[PDB]
Amino acid sequence: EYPTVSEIPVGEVRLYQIADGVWSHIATQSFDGAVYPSNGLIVRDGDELLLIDTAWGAKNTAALLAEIEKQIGLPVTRAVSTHFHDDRVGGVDVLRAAGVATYASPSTRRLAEVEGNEIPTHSLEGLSSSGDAVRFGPVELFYPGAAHSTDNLVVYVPSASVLYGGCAIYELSRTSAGNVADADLAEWPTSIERIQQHYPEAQFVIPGHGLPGGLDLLKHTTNVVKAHTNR
Numbered sequence: 090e091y092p093t094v095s096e097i098p099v100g101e102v103r104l105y106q107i108a109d110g111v112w113s114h115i116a117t118q119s120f121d122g123a124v125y126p127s128n129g130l131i132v133r134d135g136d137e138l139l140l141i142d143t144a145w146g147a148k149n150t151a152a153l154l155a156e157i158e159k160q161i162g163l164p165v166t167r168a169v170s171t172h173f174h175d176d177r178v179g180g181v182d183v184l185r186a187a188g189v190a191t192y193a194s195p196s197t198r199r200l201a202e203v204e205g206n207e208i209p210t211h212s213l214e215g216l217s218s219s220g221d222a223v224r225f226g227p228v229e230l231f232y233p234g235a236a237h238s239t240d241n242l243v244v245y246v247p248s249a250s251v252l253y254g255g256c257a258i259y260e261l262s263r264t265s266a267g268n269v270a271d272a273d274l275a276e277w278p279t280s281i282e283r284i285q286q287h288y289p290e291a292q293f294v295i296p297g298h299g300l301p302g303g304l305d306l307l308k309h310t311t312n313v314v315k316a317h318t319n320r
């Protein structure tokens with residue numbers, strides 16, 4: 090059963106097996122007076138592991154590495170952050186100190202710097218225009234266009250039909266847009282349509298926060314975003 094926010098004290102990390110060689114990682118963090126859960130991805134990359142997103146902060150990210158070593162025991166050699174916010178790059182300095190090569194798009198690295206957040210070392214090329222896709226070991230990285238943020242990426246694991254939507258996709262139980270200070274509300278529905286067109290075969294869909302689902306999370310997220318733009 091997927092771990093929930095109340096089951097994970099801040100500072101601890103759970104791993105959840107989605108498919109052979111594919112895990113989500115789940116952590117919790119305080120934000121604006123409440124504690125929220127947050128998802129990332131782990132994908133077997135031959136004899137190594139590819140990490141998608143930090144565990145939201147230095148301490149959580151150190152716990153993530155310890156849990157990976159305990160439960161999987163292969164080295165995390167590369168990490169990708171899917172946009173510039175702290176639940177995605179917070180902990181990049183810990184990853185770097187542990188030996189992990191960290192990556193993000195040029196826009197993400199730039200927006201991280203402007204924001205005063207941690208900055209992944211390496212720039213991912215080939216993702217500057219809406220609809221661009223690139224291979225990165227066992228996954229495909231896809232820029233769908235502005236949505237939750239202007240730089241947000243999604244990730245697909247072909248071997249298992251796993252779509253990691255990051256913060257551009259809401260879980261089913263989330264019905265209000267909440268915080269969207271960096272969102273492009275006008276573009277978010279269009280960006281989600283590009284995701285649907287490009288990954289019509291996705292069997293598992295992982296939002297940035299909360300419970301995994303299927304392709305219904307896309308239509309669900311457009312409803313929430315549109316309802317919010319109405320007023």
Ligand SMILES: C=CCCn1ccnc1C(=O)O
Nearest residue numbers: 120125176256267268297298
């Ligand atoms: C989990 C929602 C609270 C707001 N929030 C905090 C961190 N990330 C987000 C997001 O909206 O994606």
Ligand SMILES: [Zn+2]
Nearest residue numbers: 172174237256
């Ligand atoms: Zn964000």
Ligand SMILES: [Zn+2]
Nearest residue numbers: 174176256297
């Ligand atoms: Zn987020």
